[PDB]
């Protein structure tokens, strides 16, 4: 039983997977088996959601987070996001579940049956962490894989049904993307936008052309980069800047994933394009705005002139100006005026909310949508009582946007912590004092006193 | 009888599973009968 | 709901998503079996 106790390995049971660091075959096993865990949960969770799914209820009233993901890709839904066929959901679930058996098979094999090290078995599959060449090559393979995935999204969007477009003229619908955005000014333009209000960095992407073109770009970039990393070895400055070891690489990727986690938190909280509100429920901004719209409509039906109604503070009760002058909804929702949504935009003119349009053009479907979104705001308790904390039990509801945002903030945080942990440790180990200070060679003792 | 006849790991596993069962029951009760708000 | 043909497996389907968690617990059972060496 090689390296399977503290004595031989140096690592206690609670740090047991650290015993796998230079056992490439067993480590392969752990990784493939974990991949199987992920795929398993995708499929199983999908089937669970689908069994618990009433088609004539909004997805977001049913605690669904995967079916919304499938629906956004254009599978299973029609105009307005209405479920017209559940079978594709069933397929996604079943095929992931079946695939997880394969992955778990391979993982269990490599983990407790196959060659514990791969280097003496195969020079192609074996590796040394310090071998910068081989490392960048494996990196390369996987970059090619990622690029291929992004291109799979492109292909779905352009050649296999299209995507669900909440912005589709005449109402949200599945639409084929025929003219993806290729212009780099736009695509990387997103990357150079401020993350602050009214800008929102890449989180602000608000049309499917930009999304598809974005993935075209990312796919080519990843494939080219992957080939590049197969055919080269790290340059000198890179060599002198980095720590070259398993734990170090793990730390780098942990930092990356933490970043990605935070980014996704913001994505699901603000964006309503790749997270359609039809499937995920309204964003917080969306719902607040929707309340303002709702009572503007009610009060205006009662005979109120909403453009001239002065609120208690002196600001418009219904309508006011943004700091740069655009007409916007009044009340606290003044903070959310950067919100844009398919149900509100028909009321918007060059200077913002248009009073004539507001007086004459508001349609019943808009009232409906505003009411729905206002009454499904992403607020709710941990035991899933919907509404503000003071609400009485009755409505079983917490928005999928809340579940997704909170989960992924928690995970991004702990992954940042993990990055600090393993980065610091990788530095200490590479320099050689990760187990403590050498009593006979205590560095501080050879330093001049501070005073 | 002699100590060590039943493996401590089995005892631990069974005990743990019992704990998960009784607590699982209590969380079931949060949704059914008294305290369910229904 | 699942297609009618599969409805018989509804309870099984209700239980599957939890299985990954069990693997975590299993790691401990296993460790306890080798005395956490």
């Amino acid at each position: 039983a090689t390296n399977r106790d503290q004595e031989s390995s140096g690592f206690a049971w609670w740090a047991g997977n650290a015993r796998l660091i230079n056992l490439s075959g067993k480590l392969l096993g752990a990784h493939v088996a974990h991949a199987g865990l992920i795929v398993f949960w995708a499929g199983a969770m999908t089937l669970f959601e689908l069994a618990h799914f009433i088609p004539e209820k909004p997805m977001y009233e049913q605690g669904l987070i995967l079916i919304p993901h499938i629906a956004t890709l254009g599978w299973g839904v029609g105009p307005g996001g209405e479920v017209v066929d559940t079978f594709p959901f069933f397929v996604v679930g079943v095929v992931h579940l079946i695939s997880s058996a394969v992955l778990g098979f391979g993982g269990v094999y490599h983990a407790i049956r196959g060659p514990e090290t791969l280097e003496e078995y195969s020079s192609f599959f074996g590796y040394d962490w310090k071998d910068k060449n081989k490392m960048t090559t494996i990196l390369g393979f996987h970059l090619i894989v990622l690029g291929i995935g992004a291109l799979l999204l492109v292909a779905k969007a352009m050649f296999f049904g299209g995507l669900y477009d909440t912005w589709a003229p005449g109402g949200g619908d599945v639409r084929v993307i025929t003219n993806p955005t290729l212009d780099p000014r736009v695509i990387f333009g997103y990357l150079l936008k401020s993350p602050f209000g009214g800008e929102g960095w890449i989180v602000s992407v608000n049309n499917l052309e930009d999304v598809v073109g974005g993935h075209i770009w990312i796919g080519l970039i990843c494939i080219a980069g992957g080939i590049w990393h197969i055919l080269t070895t790290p340059f000198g400055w890179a060599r002198r800047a980095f720590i070259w070891s398993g734990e170090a690489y793990l730390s780098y990727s942990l930092g990356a994933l933490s970043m990605m986690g935070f980014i996704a938190t913001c994505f699901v909280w603000f964006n309503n394009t790749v997270y359609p509100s039809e499937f995920y429920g309204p964003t917080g901004p969306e719902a607040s705005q929707a309340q303002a719209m709702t009572f503007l409509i009610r009060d205006q039906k009662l005979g109120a002139n909403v453009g001239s109604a002065q609120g208690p503070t002196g600001l418009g009760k219904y309508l006011m100006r943004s700091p740069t002058g655009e007409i916007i909804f009044g009340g606290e929702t003044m903070r959310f005026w950067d919100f844009r949504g398919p149900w509100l935009e028909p009321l918007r003119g060059p200077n913002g909310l248009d009073l004539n349009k507001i007086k004459n053009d508001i349609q019943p479907w808009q009232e409906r949508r505003a009411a729905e979104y206002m009454t499904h705001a992403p607020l709710g308790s941990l035991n899933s009582v919907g509404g503000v904390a003071t609400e009485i039990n009755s409505v079983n509801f917490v928005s999928p946007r809340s579940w997704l945002a909170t989960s992924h903030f928690v995970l991004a945080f702990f992954f940042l912590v993990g990055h600090l942990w393993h980065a610091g440790r990788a530095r200490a180990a590479a320099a050689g004092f990760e187990k403590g200070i050498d009593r006979e060679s205590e560095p501080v003792l050879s330093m001049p006193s501070l005073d | 009888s002699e100590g060590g006849r039943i493996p401590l790991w089995i005892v631990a596993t069974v005990a743990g599973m019992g704990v998960i069962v009784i607590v699982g029951l209590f969380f079931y009760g949060a949704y059914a009968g008294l305290g369910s708000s229904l | 709901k699942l297609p009618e043909a599969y409805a018989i497996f509804d309870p099984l389907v209700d239980v599957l998503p939890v299985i990954p968690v069990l693997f975590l617990a299993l790691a401990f059972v296993w460790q306890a079996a080798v005395g956490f060496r």
């Binding site: - | 089995i10 | 309870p11 099984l12 069990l22 059972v29 296993w30």
Partner: peptide, 29 residues
Amino acid sequence: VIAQLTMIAMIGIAGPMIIFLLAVRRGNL
């Protein structure tokens, strides 16, 4: 509602069962 508990009982034992069988057969735990 019985089949759910029965199922999770079969799966839930499937775990500890592997460990037990291997421990008895003096396998490579």
